[PDB]
Design an enzyme around this catalytic site. Structure first.
Site, PDB file in Angstrom:
ATOM      1  N   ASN A  46     -23.573  -6.106  57.811  1.00  0.00           N
ATOM      2  CA  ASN A  46     -23.826  -4.860  58.532  1.00  0.00           C
ATOM      3  C   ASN A  46     -25.232  -4.342  58.201  1.00  0.00           C
ATOM      4  O   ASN A  46     -25.755  -4.636  57.126  1.00  0.00           O
ATOM      5  CB  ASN A  46     -22.798  -3.777  58.163  1.00  0.00           C
ATOM      6  CG  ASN A  46     -21.368  -4.204  58.405  1.00  0.00           C
ATOM      7  OD1 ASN A  46     -20.526  -4.114  57.514  1.00  0.00           O
ATOM      8  ND2 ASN A  46     -21.091  -4.679  59.602  1.00  0.00           N
ATOM      9  N   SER A  50     -23.610  -3.557  53.804  1.00  0.00           N
ATOM     10  CA  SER A  50     -22.261  -4.012  53.505  1.00  0.00           C
ATOM     11  C   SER A  50     -22.010  -5.257  54.337  1.00  0.00           C
ATOM     12  O   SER A  50     -22.853  -5.595  55.182  1.00  0.00           O
ATOM     13  CB  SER A  50     -21.239  -2.929  53.774  1.00  0.00           C
ATOM     14  OG  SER A  50     -21.190  -2.632  55.150  1.00  0.00           O
ATOM     15  N   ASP A  52     -18.601  -7.496  56.492  1.00  0.00           N
ATOM     16  CA  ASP A  52     -17.247  -7.499  57.046  1.00  0.00           C
ATOM     17  C   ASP A  52     -16.620  -8.880  56.797  1.00  0.00           C
ATOM     18  O   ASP A  52     -17.330  -9.865  56.971  1.00  0.00           O
ATOM     19  CB  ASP A  52     -17.274  -7.213  58.563  1.00  0.00           C
ATOM     20  CG  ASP A  52     -17.664  -5.801  58.986  1.00  0.00           C
ATOM     21  OD1 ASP A  52     -17.543  -4.846  58.168  1.00  0.00           O
ATOM     22  OD2 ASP A  52     -18.076  -5.665  60.146  1.00  0.00           O
ATOM     23  N   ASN A  59     -14.386  -3.984  55.737  1.00  0.00           N
ATOM     24  CA  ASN A  59     -15.733  -3.688  55.241  1.00  0.00           C
ATOM     25  C   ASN A  59     -15.768  -3.469  53.720  1.00  0.00           C
ATOM     26  O   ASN A  59     -14.891  -2.834  53.157  1.00  0.00           O
ATOM     27  CB  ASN A  59     -16.268  -2.448  55.975  1.00  0.00           C
ATOM     28  CG  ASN A  59     -17.714  -2.165  55.662  1.00  0.00           C
ATOM     29  OD1 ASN A  59     -18.008  -1.304  54.837  1.00  0.00           O
ATOM     30  ND2 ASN A  59     -18.612  -2.949  56.234  1.00  0.00           N
ATOM     31  N   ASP A 101      -5.253   6.130  58.254  1.00  0.00           N
ATOM     32  CA  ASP A 101      -6.175   7.118  57.702  1.00  0.00           C
ATOM     33  C   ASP A 101      -6.249   8.389  58.553  1.00  0.00           C
ATOM     34  O   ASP A 101      -6.198   9.491  58.003  1.00  0.00           O
ATOM     35  CB  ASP A 101      -7.599   6.584  57.570  1.00  0.00           C
ATOM     36  CG  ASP A 101      -8.524   7.602  56.923  1.00  0.00           C
ATOM     37  OD1 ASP A 101      -8.371   7.834  55.698  1.00  0.00           O
ATOM     38  OD2 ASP A 101      -9.353   8.192  57.658  1.00  0.00           O
TER      39      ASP A 101
END
Ligand code: NA
Length: 129
Positions: A46, A50, A52, A59, A101
């Protein structure tokens, strides 16, 4: 492992994703198609630095530890490499945490852009489930 379409639908259903938090099975198969092309080994960097990982492209900033993402959480308590297995148990359990979430499946950019609002049902057509 590169799954077949109906093979992956059967594995996701066995693990309890059909209608999990109100999302039908075609949604989860469509997300996997456009995130990973059904390949457990898929990895993608990314812009924020980071990475994936796996069938659902989970992530390293928030969800798993890969050793190279500064200032990061590991909320699924797993090494990111666990998400590349031919056994999808780790990917599924972490996905169940993410989708609970509050933003639901909007957490997956490929789902929002290529699956949401389409005939996702088509992704399980022909499959004996
Ligand atoms: Na991390």
């Amino acid at each position: 492992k590169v799954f077949g379409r109906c093979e992956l639908a059967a594995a996701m259903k066995r693990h309890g994703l059909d209608n999990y938090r109100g999302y039908s099975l075609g949604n989860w198969v469509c997300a996997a198609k456009f995130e990973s092309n059904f390949n457990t080994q898929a990895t993608n960097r990314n812009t924020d630095g980071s990475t994936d990982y796996g069938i659902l492209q989970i992530n390293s900033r928030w969800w798993c530890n890969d050793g190279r993402t500064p200032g990061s959480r590991n909320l699924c308590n797993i090494p990111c490499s666990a998400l590349l297995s031919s056994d999808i148990t780790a990917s599924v359990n972490c996905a169940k945490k993410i989708v609970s979430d509050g933003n639901g499946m909007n957490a997956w950019v490929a789902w929002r852009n290529r699956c949401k609002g389409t005939d996702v049902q088509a992704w399980i057509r022909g499959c004996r489930l």
